[PDB]
Amino acid sequence: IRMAKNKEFFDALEEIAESAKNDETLRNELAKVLDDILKTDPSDPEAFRKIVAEHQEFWDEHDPSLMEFNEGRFFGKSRKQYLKSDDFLNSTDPTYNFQKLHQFAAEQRVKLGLEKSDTDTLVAILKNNPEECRAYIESKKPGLGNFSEGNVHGWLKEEYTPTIPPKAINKSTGVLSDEAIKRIKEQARDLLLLKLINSSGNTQLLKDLRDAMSKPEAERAANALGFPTEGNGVLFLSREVVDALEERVEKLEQEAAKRGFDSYVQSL
């Protein structure tokens, strides 16, 4: 058991995002909830408790436990009072405080937008370094969130690395940490691999990836499938990608057997 609902809201954001993977209506609803959280100053605990509680209708549709107020404990407190206390959302939480919830929300908002993003954006996430990634995410507004000054609290002014042309960089590590960018790249990796797998008809190449026994072997196959070498640093085969690989090879082999049979059954 944990004090207050802080951790439950963390896990709820992830699990609702999961349920939104193929539910476009829920995606838009969750995007608005995340957008509202991100525009709120997490060092203003009253404004932050208020923006979370203001979406009670949304939270109730997914887990009534988040907004549940058992008047058995906290008996001297009304519901309106509880929703403003640390017993609802603990601002001094050692682990899941409002700053961490804000930072988590920024990462989820990007991943939410990545889900249906095109190939080129997945590749851009893998090719850009973390500073470049933050600026690129701003460039995609609002597809990956409204990451811009005044619309996400603490988002910094865009800077530039003096190449020709200047490359946009953003140093808002207090909003999207380097570790959040790393997990964003891991999700982009999986999303892109799944696209390349579905588009490929090269059964042997897909088998080479499916049967890879080491990272160099996986790199050679994935790169031949179109995965960018700039993503090799984060290349790791996850459960979902392995499962897609097995099913795709099986489908291609069934289809190949149905044709090789017919090219023979009416031939002779």
Residue numbers in the entry: 7 to 274
Report text from the authors:
The effector RidL binds the Vps29 retromer subunit, blocks retrograde vesicle trafficking, and promotes intracellular bacterial replication. The 131-kDa Icm/Dot substrate RidL binds the retromer subunit Vps29 as well as PtdIns(3)P and impairs retrograde trafficking. Here, we show that the 29-kDa N-terminal domain of RidL (RidL2–281) adopts a “foot-like” fold comprising a protruding hydrophobic β-hairpin, which determines the interaction with the Vps29 retromer subunit and displaces the regulator TBC1D5 from the retromer. Thus, the hydrophobic β-hairpin of RidL is critical for binding of the L. pneumophila effector to the Vps29 retromer subunit and displacement of the regulator TBC1D5.
Using this approach, we obtained well-diffracting crystals of the N-terminal 29 kDa fragment (aa 2–281) belonging to space group I422 with one molecule in the asymmetric unit. The structure of RidL2–281 was solved at 1.9-Å resolution. The electron densities allowed for building a model comprising residues 7–274. The structure features a “foot-like” fold, consisting primarily of interacting bundles of α-helices connected by loops of various lengths. The surface representation of B-factors indicates an increasing flexibility from the heel to the toes of the foot. At the heel of the foot, positioned between helices 8 and 9, there is a surface-exposed hairpin formed by 2 antiparallel β-strands connected by a loop comprising 5 residues (aa 160–180, termed “β-hairpin”). The β-hairpin is structurally well defined and rigid, as well as hydrophobic (based on surface charge distribution). The β-hairpin and in particular the sequence motif PTIPP at its tip is conserved among L. pneumophila RidL homologs. The three prolines in this motif break the antiparallel β-strands and stiffen the tip of the loop. Thereby, the side chain of the conserved Ile170 forms an exposed hydrophobic spot.
